[PDB]
Amino acid sequence: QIKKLLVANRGEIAIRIFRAAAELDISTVAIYSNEDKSSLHRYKADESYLVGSDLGPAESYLNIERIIDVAKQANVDAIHPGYGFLSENEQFARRCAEEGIKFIGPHLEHLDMFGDKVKARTTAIKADLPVIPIDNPKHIEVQVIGDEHGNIVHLFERDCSVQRRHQKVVEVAPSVGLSPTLRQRICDAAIQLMENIKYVNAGTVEFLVSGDEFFFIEVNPRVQVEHTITEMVTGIDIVKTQILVAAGADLFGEEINMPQQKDITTLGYAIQCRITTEDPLNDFMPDTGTIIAYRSSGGFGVRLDAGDGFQGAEISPYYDSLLVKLSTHAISFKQAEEKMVRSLREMRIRGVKTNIPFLINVMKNKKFTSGDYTTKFIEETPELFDIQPSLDRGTKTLEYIGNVTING
């Protein structure tokens, strides 16, 4: 029934929802702030509105009442919150229902359980899942999608072990090195939990792995950044599915066309990382300014999700930095790693320092290439911060010619 969708978000994910929505012949509505006046997502929808006349920085995409007003005036049926803003916000979800706008995600009582780190454990132990009663851990996450009609499936797992601190860096789907029996139990735990609470829409279940053992951590009651990696290996459009799930449709019907859990398998491996302005040379402080040159990769198995990565782009410090979200997909993990490297090396960003060289080394290192690696992979790798200089030739030649042409 959903005919007009609004995205309560910015960047690559908004563009993602908009494209998905358009494939379903749904009109799109963007929301933008003053400093996002030339963000690509603003121009990528059927409609865009300045949320908050005088609103500040990151509070623009958090301002519940102005968003809902923009939704009311434009006749919006459903709001997709993407991730990382009002995604896990019960209040916004309530005010959506109360005003007749379908909140794209799980129900009010779903965001309640998993919003509080203390309440989630009670739910976890009621469905008989292992909890913290803790060394050498692997961070494993299971994707799930269920409809409003009781049909629930999982889209296998995602290795999330590569992380520097509390920041995820590199994800893999499915697991390399992790046994088939382990795989199944962790999946079956995730489906036991969500099928107990009668879960609706896309959700992620965060676990931990020691050897032949796992522990429940948290539940992300929305879409994740790393979703695409799972799409590539299972062939299933998660985002598009969400829109269909909030539209009532049965996942085994004409709209979603979900293959029965038995018929769901993985094809090859997929890897993802984010291209940010973070400088390995400079404590990972996000760099700001204007990009003067932007060239991107592509090709078979390479998937680009641009955020602030374009030619004219002006980088505002007020948001979590993200230029391009880059994923690769090949029959083998070895092959999947190589595409990533080349794509990373084929890139070119100038006028701002990037995290590319750091990422290059990560994919190049064999403690990652082996498939066996823990959350302390970065901790145990000091050489991962090797100083590759990176000179900029062409630019200097363009300046010389430019100067002599105009000034003699």
Q: Return the active site residues.
A: 222
356: contact with its own copies by CB under 8 A: no
89: contact with its own copies by CB under 8 A: no
Q: How far apart are CA 249 and CA 349, in angstroms?
A: 43
* C-alpha angle 69-89-187 in degrees, rounded to nearest 5: 135
Map residues 294-333 to x or -, x wherever contact with its own copies holds by CB under 8 A: ---xxxxx-xxxx----------------------xxxx-
286 torsion bin: left (phi>0), alpha (psi -120 to 50), beta (else): beta
Report the residue from 125, 267, 398, 401 that binds its own copies according to the rule CB under 8 A: 267
177: contact with its own copies by CB under 8 A: no
Nearest approach, Cβ of 268 to its own copies (angstroms)? Answer: 4
Nearest approach, Cβ of 239 to its own copies (angstroms)? Answer: 8
Q: How far apart are CA 324 and CA 339, in angstroms?
A: 16
137: contact with its own copies by CB under 8 A: no
Nearest approach, Cβ of 159 to its own copies (angstroms)? Answer: 19
Q: Which is nearer to its own copies, 258 or 359 (CB)?
A: 258
Of 321, 144, 325, nearest in space to 226 by CA = 325
Report the residue from 3, 72, 165, 334 that binds its own copies according to the rule CB under 8 A: 334
125: contact with its own copies by CB under 8 A: no
Instruction: Answer whether 35's CB lies under 8 Å from 316's CB.
Output: yes
Among residue numbers 203 through 232, which ones bind its own copies (CB under 8 A)? 228, 231-232
237: contact with its own copies by CB under 8 A: yes
Residue type, 386: D
The site for its own copies (CB under 8 A) is made up of 19, 228, 231-232, 235-237, 239-240, 254, 257-259, 267-268, 297-301, 303-306, 329-332, 334-335
